[PDB]
Structure formats: structure tokens, C-alpha cells
Symmetry: none
Subunit: 324 residues, 5 copies
Amino acid sequence: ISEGTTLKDLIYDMTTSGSGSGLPLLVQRTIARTIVLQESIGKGRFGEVWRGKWRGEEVAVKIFSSREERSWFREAEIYQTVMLRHENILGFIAADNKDNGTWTQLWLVSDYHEHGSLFDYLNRYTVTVEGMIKLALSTASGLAHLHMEIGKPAIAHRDLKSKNILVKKNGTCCIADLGLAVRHDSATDTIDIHRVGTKRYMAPEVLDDSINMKHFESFKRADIYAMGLVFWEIARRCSIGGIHEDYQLPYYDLVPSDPSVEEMRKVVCEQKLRPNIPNRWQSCEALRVMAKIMRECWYANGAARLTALRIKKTLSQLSQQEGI
Amino acid sequence: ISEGTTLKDLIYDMTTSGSGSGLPLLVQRTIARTIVLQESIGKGRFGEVWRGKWRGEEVAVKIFSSREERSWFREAEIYQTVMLRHENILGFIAADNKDNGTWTQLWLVSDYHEHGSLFDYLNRYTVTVEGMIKLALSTASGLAHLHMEIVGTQGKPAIAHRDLKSKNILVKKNGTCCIADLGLAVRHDSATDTIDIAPNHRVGTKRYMAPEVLDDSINMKHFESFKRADIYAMGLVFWEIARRCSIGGIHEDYQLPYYDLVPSDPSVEEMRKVVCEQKLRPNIPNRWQSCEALRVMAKIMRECWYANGAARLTALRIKKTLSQLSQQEG
Amino acid sequence: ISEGTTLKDLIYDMTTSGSGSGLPLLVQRTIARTIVLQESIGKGRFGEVWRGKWRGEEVAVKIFSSREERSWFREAEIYQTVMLRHENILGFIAADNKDNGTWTQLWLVSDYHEHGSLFDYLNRYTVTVEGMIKLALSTASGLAHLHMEIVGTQGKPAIAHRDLKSKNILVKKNGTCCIADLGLAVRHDSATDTIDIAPNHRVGTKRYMAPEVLDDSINMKHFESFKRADIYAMGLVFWEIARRCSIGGIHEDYQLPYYDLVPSDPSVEEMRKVVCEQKLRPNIPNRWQSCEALRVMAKIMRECWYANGAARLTALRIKKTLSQLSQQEG
Amino acid sequence: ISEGTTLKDLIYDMTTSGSGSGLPLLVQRTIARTIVLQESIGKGRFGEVWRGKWRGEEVAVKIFSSREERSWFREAEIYQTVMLRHENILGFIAADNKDNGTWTQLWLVSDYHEHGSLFDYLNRYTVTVEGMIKLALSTASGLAHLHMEIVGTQGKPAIAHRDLKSKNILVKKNGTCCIADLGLAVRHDSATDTIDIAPNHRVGTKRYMAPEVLDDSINMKHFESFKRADIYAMGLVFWEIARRCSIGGIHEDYQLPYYDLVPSDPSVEEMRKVVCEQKLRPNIPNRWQSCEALRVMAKIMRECWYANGAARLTALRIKKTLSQLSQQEG
Amino acid sequence: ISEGTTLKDLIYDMTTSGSGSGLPLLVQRTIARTIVLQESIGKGRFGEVWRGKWRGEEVAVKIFSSREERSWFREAEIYQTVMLRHENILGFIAADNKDNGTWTQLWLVSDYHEHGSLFDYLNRYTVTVEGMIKLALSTASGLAHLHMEIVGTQGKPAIAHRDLKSKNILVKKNGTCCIADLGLAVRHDSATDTIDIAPNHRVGTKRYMAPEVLDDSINMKHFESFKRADIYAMGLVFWEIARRCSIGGIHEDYQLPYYDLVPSDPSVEEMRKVVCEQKLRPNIPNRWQSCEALRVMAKIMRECWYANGAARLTALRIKKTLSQLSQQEG
């Protein structure tokens, strides 16, 4: 990387001429080992996420704990091997490793989004009907692209939630955290594979353990159910005429912080309960369309739920009718 | 192979790659020299098979004796060269070598199947009529794929095993099989009508040698001769299988073919007298007329044991009729 | 580069090179580090431009200040990665770097034009009606080529200059022009609908900044916004040109646009008031109604100065109508 | 060439490869420098031919004399560059060099044929009418392939042997032949109408030199001239063959062409008088009118011995009519 | 280059497969630095031409004077950059350089023609009517090929010699010719209408300079101007040739064009007066009306000497009509 080169230049180059594939390993290494960390931004099972700068420009750095090397590799593997680039998917920049044994240092580098996670964004703000559409549409667009097979294999996130989604300056979203993701090669009907993910968003089939992990579709479906819970968190903060609910996680009133697999299973599987869809949401077209989707996402039977592409389509429709 | 990489990842990548080729030699080397052997699993002419682990995940390692280098190369050659790969064929992972002269260490690495060889499996168990079909069908499917020629790029030449037997077959968790040990295998390039033979003379376990092979009347100029000998032995294997097919508590004790007509470790001559001269074959039990399945099987076995090779069934044939019998079950 | 090689040879080879490539980095380096500087020719935000010689032949060398490395890279980047080669665009020859840290030396090498910038040229001369057309036509031709997008191997993305002006234009021996200084240029990949300089402020010479740019109402999300700002400034340039078009001894003295409505080195605010608020434009002399040429030009200038960018003429448009006028006289 | 690799494996791989090409220089070197010579097999202008073994398997090694480097290169060049491989052409395996100056050691390696040259074979045996056909057909097939030009990448230029004779032909286990010794061979690129040599001389075994060659009236500007001379000699060879075709115990003793009209090691002049002047040819025995085969052969021989080259049969022609005679009785 | 390699082999390879117009630089270097000079053959502005041998085989070596590096490069550049290889153009083999500064040694290597230049050849001999045709036809063929433009990548640009004369033409063993010395040659890329010029002032031997060149009225903006000047000189050459065409013992003594109207080593001015002013041309002998051949030639010469270039015949034209006459004899 010569003098004057900027992050933008790099990204632009892989994005255009790059031909699906990303920066050269040597370049990734150089970027990584030449970044300057600012401060921490968040944690997780993996490790910590930091806000860093590369030659002035901001960037996000996920630093893994030596004992979490599998997550580091898995996620980098899915990004690079697949050449999975998309407006609504956290933009991968580089991967790198540094020490030996116990002190091995594993990093991943991506675009930086000052707004943080959708979770933080919704706790900090309320949103326009237009704003709500932007967020939901983008999120659906991304999940649609992940599930879509092309080229690239189909991918199931396996851990969707407001905290794994980031919001850009332009009020759009991008899925993030592919550490638990699963791939499906149709041409071989194989899936490099154990219930994982945040309990609060686990789908019904997943909770009672009735899910068939032999059919890749099972995973795509569980993704939709959670994406529905996310749309719920969003619409809740869609303020029309000063009226809006306070930010709340799904099932915030039916189960304790840090729900157990059992606590969740009782409310979701047994009691067959779902987040409460407010009455006022019948107000405008938008709120209705959304409420509609949410229901067609929460079905106990997965094969009955809507598909990501489906939601992207109908949500894309509601958007043109809004002149967005 | 970087941190966090798992065996699954590796396999997945070669599997879902543009080339039917396998892992890069450097990767094979690294895997090999980084495996951790557990304990022995079995022996043979080649050397020993061990159960090993690579970063925790289990794997099988065939360690050859320096003096058996030809078998090591031959088998690795057949696997890599033609991107052989099939559900019913032991999955090759890597090959590697280590020392010099006398102490050269030759290894081969493949998938691990906790059940061991069909031989061990039958000695340890008895099986369902359905179970018996699974085993025979799968075995036939594999031998079919080996014998099958596919002209073109990602195609493969026809291959004759030359040493089939319950001990060279492995059984998976799902009660399926996969042929193994291609050290004596022979290739046939139709487009050149050329047959390559590393061990040109008679080879293989005496007990399963076909008639043409025993009296030495076989024409090793016609590749077909080899495919046929394979069938005869596959017949003996089906015999060992059906014998343990317990229907209503009734079943025979495990027994190798010709267990009553010849001593352990039969000589080429002892075998030739019973098979060629006396024209004897394993005894097909009377009760095997009981159900459809047992009959179909007994049928095949006979159409496999013909003294005249050209008269025997083909692997694809057996795969077909056995695939049929399967359809009407479960 | 071997003995006897001349600059001409090099240029001819890349030019005539079927494969749309410029010179090999190693050759660029050698040329650069083997040039012999003569003396300074001009300055700017970037650094200084020098007239130098490579094995006798003249050439221009833009030497950047260490602290201006981004401009150096940006400009070289746009030239090389795109193949951008055009009769009416300063001809790029090579780029190179030399020291470390504080004393890093960044160079760029191009064709040498003894006439200098259009600015110097107009201050030194007056011009024929034919002369005026040559200059305006060529300039338009170049801006047209920059803005033009082409999908294909030897194709190029669309590019917006973002800092057009008489001082960034050079005039050749044959009275033609060529745009120069692509340090602020922006690229647009249609097939991805993506920009180059993603987060940008307001750049360029204040005096020529377009209205949308001055009040900051410009939409930097639509690439077109930039093309339009380029036209507005190109209009101011045509103005500087026509002003020196002497027909029968009558002609105005050279003057920069808005020379009478704002101080030397105008501030963003001083300019915004005169251009945005007072809605003023350079004064289009009365005599310019004299001949066809002067009228065509005055016409364009107005259709370039519109407050609303989407209302302005396009580069290709001006190139066409100006090509016509130049056609009405040989 | 790892452990366990065998010659067969190597040959099989190059053979069954769409590359149509041969072994990597590094592999050739390794084979060459790792071969173990057994003993001498024959001599010639070039040097000596030895029977050697590579890891047990037999192979032939032609060791040239330092002063004969041109023959070494020339032959290896024609084999490798051209990608020349054919059932009826000695199979090239490798080429290598070793010392410096005076003691430079130049080697060539090929398949080994225990039967030796046709010359030795005919001196040691007599042959069936069928046998005679096999030999003549194969030889023609090879010469046909050499002379044949092919435009595709799997194709090659036309080649003239320039030194055909029973001593340069080898006989395989299956009673077939293969031309050998391409040290004097000439190439013809039709697409450029160019030759591979400086025919500035006269080469080859005197005894088989064609008429045009002897009197020196041959036009070495027309590649055809060479093909024709090849046919004349191939005729002399068919003569040596038919002579030993024993039908009912009756057959002549092996004899070289012109054995009765000129001394051992004939001079260019001695030969020219008998062939050019006296216009003599080998005597075609009366009994050869006995059967069809002998007649067909005698026919060819005459249509090969014409004084005028352009009048002689072509290799493909002979291959065709000889292929006919053959197919009438497998 | 390994043992046994011969010059022929090298040439054949580049001629045939070698995609790059010619041999690999490393091979060129080796050849050059391994040649053995015999003795001098001639001089010129460039330097000296020597007869040398590479591994015995003869070859020509043009050794340039350090101060003439531009000619060395220019000529090598024109040869290599285009694959320019034609029967009637001196065959390029290699280029190489050796020392530093003042003692830099620049070489060029080509085929050797024992006959030397047409100039020497005509001074040493007289020629047949057939012989004369051979020489004129060949020369025209070559100049035709140089002037001819071919658009594919397997094509080339049009080239003007700019210094044709009996001393820059060589005669082969077969009485044919080949143009030589492309040091002043000029290239024309039609697809860009660019005239790659070496020295942009009048160059070449005064005695053969065309009229337009002498008075300096030539338009060096139109590539055609150069092709035309080439024809005028080629006409003077045909004159020098016919002069030595002896029919029945009658023939003139060798003489350079304008040998009687101007001093040895004519000045630009001396020539201009006789050619431009006095409008004089070489005297076309009366006897040349004798036979068809001599007339055809005299015809051409006149249609080559026109004061107006655009009026002269084209190389292809002359090649055609001369090719016709050639066929009217055999």
C-alpha cells in the first residue's frame, strides 16, 4: 500500500475490478498490523470489537480470544471463500494473526458504523414511518442475499438479532457476525455443520429441539422467525405523531433477562405466545404491512413462514408507494 | 492450515471446489505430520491401519512398511490421479512420506469408520433383512462405480479392485459400506486400450481368488477378465452377509467362504482343487428360500460363482436388481 | 530501458500497444530517477511543476510536497488504473516515489507543452475566431471524454474533474488544449453505482465553484451533480477565452471570471453572495453579437451558467455544437 | 518421482494425458542419472545403445560420443518439441547431459525392445506370410505418421527420416515394428514453407541412399524430395523382409540390399554405378509370385524403386494397400 | 543454448513456433557473446559489418560505434517489435550490448550473404535478362512488404526505408535480394494516423534523395510522402541493375546514378540543381529498347522518376508488372 493510499481506494478497488474476491493477504496483513486502535465498542462470545483507524480513516476491529480461534476462522472463511459482499452485510476488509500458542492474536477488520447496533440505535432513537421501512427493507435485503444461492452458496445466519445488526449513516442496515453461519452446497446437498444462538430469539423448532438439521431449509426458517422479532423491535419505535412505545426486547414481559432454554420453550412452544402486536399498529398502511409480516414469520410451523426474498419484495413494494 | 481450521472445513473445500482434485500436497503433508495416532485398528499385506486424530477429529491412518512402498504409491496414485471419490468408497484425505532408506515412513490418511471392516462387523453382529440389503446394495454400488468408465475431464478410467473381501470393506454409522484398499487395483484407458498392472502376476487373498485366477487360465489382456474376478469374490462376500441375516432368531455363525473345505491361510493349490476341480462353491442354506430377499441374494451368488467369467452378472446389474429389492422394503 | 531508446519510442510503444497499458513500473521508475530537471514552470496546492529533460527530450515533472501525498496518489491512480488516454488530456508518462517519512519525494511525469496553461496563454495573446474555436472545441472534447463512461476492456469509468479552470488547462503548439490535474477527480462505476471519493467536502478553486457547490445544496449522492459543476466552470473558461478573441483589433484585456465582483483569492462566502444571492454571472459583452462564432459561444456560456445544474448543457452537447461551428469554416 | 513410482506409472501418465506431451526435464534428469546400465546392445555413427534398468524395469539408453552432440540434440529436439508419439515409433522417455567440455556425456532414453533391430530379427528368424505383413504394415504406418503433417495442437510438422534401414527399425514382442533414430531427420513447416536443416551435404547409410541422392541430382529445396528418398529405402527394407518369408520351408538367407553387387561398406561411387548407371535393383525372386501377399509386396517394391522419385508410391499409399492385404486375413 | 544446437535450429524455432517475433533475449545475448568474428565486410554511417561464425556457421555482425547508439536501437526496435520477417528483407537474428559509457559495445546479428551488397555484386558481375528480373522483382517484393500495412496482431505497420540504394541491398546465393539497414526507417500506425519518426529532418544518402526531399518541399505529415521517395530511389537502383544486363556481350560499366552529373559524395545543393532545377535523370540507354525486359524496366524507371511523387508507381504495382514479365520467360 503506497503513500497517499486511503481505505476508500482499497475498498473501491476490490468492489469494482476485484471480481468478487477481496484484498490480497499481504495487503490485509499490512492494514491489520498498521491500524491504530482507539477504544472498545462492544463484546460478545467471540471477544471484543474496537473502533480503530487506518491512516486516519475509521474502521472496526474484532479481536478474538485465543481460545475462540474457531469463530475467528469460521467467520473469515465464510467471508473470503464465498466472496459474499452486499450493501446489507457488514463489509469485510481483512483478517490477520500474530503471536504463537497461548498469546496468538486473531483479528478481523471491517467497515466502521458510528451508529452502532440496531439495538443501541433503537434505544437511542424513535423513527419515521419511512425510517422504519428503510431499516426493515435493508435487513430483509441482506438476509435475502445470505439465504440466496448462486456464485455463492446459501447461508443461514443462525443468530440474528438487533445486536447483530448495524445501522449506517443513511439509516440502512447490514447483518453482522457470521461466526455461527452454516453453508449449503446444493450441487452436493451438503452443509458443513448443537443448538446455538441467543436464547431469546431461538425459533420454536429450535427450542423444543424438533428441528430437522438435515434439511438446510430448517435454518433459513429459524432465521426468518428471529428477523420477525427484530421487525417487532423496530415498529415499536416507529413514532407517528409523538406516539410510540419504549424500546423493548422481544418477550421482555414474559421472561427474565438472560432467558434459559426452558423458560423460553414454555412461553414460545407451550403457551404458544408471541410478542404483542399493538392495537395502534393498524393506524397506517406501513404499520399494517409490518404487523402482517411479523405474523407470517412467527408461525409455529417453519415451512409456513415467509421467505426473506418474499419479505424483501413486499417491503420493497411498500417503499415505492411511499416515494422513499 | 491456520488456527481454527477444522477437518470439516478442509473436506468441504475440496468437495465443493471446481476441481475433483483434492487437498494441496503442502496441506496433506501438514495434516499427516500433525496427526496424533491413537492405537492400531488392523493389519494386512500393506502394513497397519491406525485410528488417529487431527486437531481432535478422528481419522484413519494406513502406515506402510518400507518394503511395501509400491502398494503405498499405487493406491495414492489411483486416488489422486483420477479424483476418485464416491459415497461408497473409502474417503481419501492425504498421503505423505518421511525418512530415508530403510526407515522411510509411508502414510495414507482417510475417513474413520468406528465400525471397522465388514468382516469384524459380521463377526460382531447378525443383521436385519433390511440391513443385509443396505450392505449388499452399497457394496455393489461402489464396485459399480469403480468398474464404471466416464470419458471426459472430470471422468475416470475403469478400475478393477483385484482383492475384494469382507476385510477390505468398511461399514459406516448408517449401515452402508465402502470399498477400500486400492493397492492392487488396475486401470483401463479405453481410448488407448491400455491396462496398467503394478503386480502383473496373480495377486490377492487366496481364499477369494476366482477360478480363472486359480488355474491361471485367465486372460490378463482383456480388462474384463479382472472385473469378472471381482464379481466372483463379491459373491463370496454376499454369502458371508446373508449367513448372518437373522430372521426370527435363526441365523448361521459367521464363517469365511470355504471355511469347511480348506485350512486357514489356504494355498493356491488347496483352493484350486476345491474351486476348479471339485467345482465346489459355498453351501447355499436351505432356509434361504424363506423370504424374497434371501432368494434374490442366493440367486445373485450363483450368477456370480459361474466357472465361466463371461457368464457372471455385472456390478451394475447386481446394483440394479438389488436396488429393486430395496425399493419394496421400508 | 536500453541505450539509444528515446522518449518518442516509449510513447509510441504504449500508444501503439494493442493492450491498453502504459509503461512498466520499472521503466517509469528509471525514467523518473534519470530525468534532469531544468527549472520551475508553475505552482499550485499540490506542489510545483518543472520542465525537465529525459535523455535530451523535454518533459514535465510535477513534484509534490510530502504532506500532499494523497493528491499525488489520487492523480496517478486515476491515470494508470483507467488507461485514460486522450488527445485533449495531459499525457501521463510515469509516477514514482523516493525517500522516507518527512522527506518522501513524490513525482509525476507527463508531456511537456512549451505554451503553458491556457491562463498564461490568454494573458500573453489574443486569438483568431478560428483560434478561439480550436481552444473551446478541444477543451469540450476532453471534458466530454472524462465524463463519458465506457463499458469494456479498453473502457473507462465516467470521471468528473472537480476543479476545471484556465490554469488547469494547457495549450499545445497546434493551438489545441488538454485538461490537466486530476488530483480531485471522482470516478463512477455505473455497474455498481458507486463513487470514488466517498465522504467529500467542497474542493476546488473558489472563484470557479458552481452555485450548488457554494451554497452547499449540491447532492453528492448523484454523480451527475459533479459533471454539472464541471460545465459551469467550463463556461467561465469559455468566457475568459472569447474575451481575448480579437476581431479587427477589438478585444478586452485578459480577466479572470468575477474579476470585478470579488477580491483576489475570493472566500467561499464572498463568492456565494455574488453567485448564489445576487445571482450574477460574468458580463457577456455587447460586441459578442458581432459574428456567428461569438454568438454561439455566448449562447453556450449562458446554458452553462444556469443556477439549476440539471438545466445546463452537457459536455458532449457543447462538443457537438462547437464541432458544428468549427465545421462552418473548415 | 517419489518412492514406489515405477516406469510403467510414468509412461501411463504421459500416455493417458490430453497434454500429448512428455515428462518434466527435472524428472528426465532424475531418471537418466538414476538408471543402472546393464550392458551394450549395439553401435552406430551416434555412439552406443545400452540396455539399462530404472528401478528394476528395463529401458534402452543411447549414449553419444562428445563429438556427436549434434545428433544427440537433433534427435531429442525432434522428439520433444514436436510431441512425437506413435505406436510404430520408438518411444522416447528422456534426454540428459552431464559433464563439461571434452567429457560431456549426452544421453537419450527410450523403451526397451528385447528383439532388437529388424536387421538382427531377420538374421535370427524367418517369417510367416502373416508375420511379414505385420512387419511391413507397421513400418509403413510409422513412416506414414512421420511424413504426415497435422495442423491441430496435437499435430506436428512433416518429417523425413533420411536414414531408414533394417538396422534402424525395432521389432516388438507382438511382431510389430517402430522406426528409430531421428538424428538426421528433417522438418517441414508448410505454413512457412521452410526446412529444418542446411541440406548442404549428403547423409545416411550409403547402401540405402536413393538414386537422386547418389548422383546428387536431388532438389533439396522441395521437402518432397526427402519423403521420396525415404520410400526408396523403405522398399529395400520390404525386400529384406519378404526374402525371409518362409512358405513351406522355402526361403532365402538373410541378405542386405545389393549384397551381391557391391562390397561391405559401399562407397558413394560404387553404389552410384550400380544404382544410377547400371540401373540395377535388388533381384525380385521368381517364387514371390507364389501367393497374393508376396505379389503385393513385390509390386510395392518396384513402385518404390523407380529412378524418378515423383513416380514412387507414398507412405500413406503403401499403408493403405498393405492394410488391405492385411484385413483380408486379420 | 545446449550442446549440439545449431543456428538453423534456432532460426527454425523462432520462424515456426516462437510467438515473440524472435529468439529470447537471453538466447540472443548468448549467441552474440559467443560468436567469433572473422573479418570486416563493410562500413557505413552506423559502424562496420563483419562476417562472423557462431559454432562454425557463418553469420553477419553489425558493430556500432558508441556514438551511434540511436541507429542501433532504432533498427533493432523496428525488427523485434513487429516480427518483420520476409524473404526479401535481411534476416534479423539478435541484438546485444556490452560495456559502459564510452566503450559500450552495440551489436546486431543477421544472416550472412557471401555475395555482399548489390553494389559489390554489380561491380563484380554482369547479368542475364533473367538474372536482372530476379534482382529487380525480389527488391520490389521486399520494398512492397515494408510499405504494406497489415492490421492483425500477426500483422505490422507500414514502414518506409528512407535510405534505399545498391549498397543497402544484399544478394543471396540464389540471385535474389533482400533490403537491409532499417536504422532510418519510419513507422506508420494507420489506426492512430501517427508517424513514428526517428530523425525528422532529411536523412539518407544524398545521391539517391528524391526531388521533394532535395528542395525540401516534401510533406512529412503524410506518410505517403516517404513511400514515394523510396520508389524514386528504387528506380535509380533498377537503373544500376539494367546497366549491367549483358545481352550478347553488350553492357555498360557499373556506375552509380548521376555519376556523370555530380562529384563523389555529392552535396545536397549539387544534387538539388541537377535533379530539381535542370530536371535531369539518369540516361536511359538507347539499346534498352532491344528486348521486352529492358523496355519494361525502362518504363518503370521513368514512372519512378517523376518530379511529382503522387504520380509515381507503387511498390506493389512494380512487383505485379515485374512479376508478370518474369512469367513471360520462366
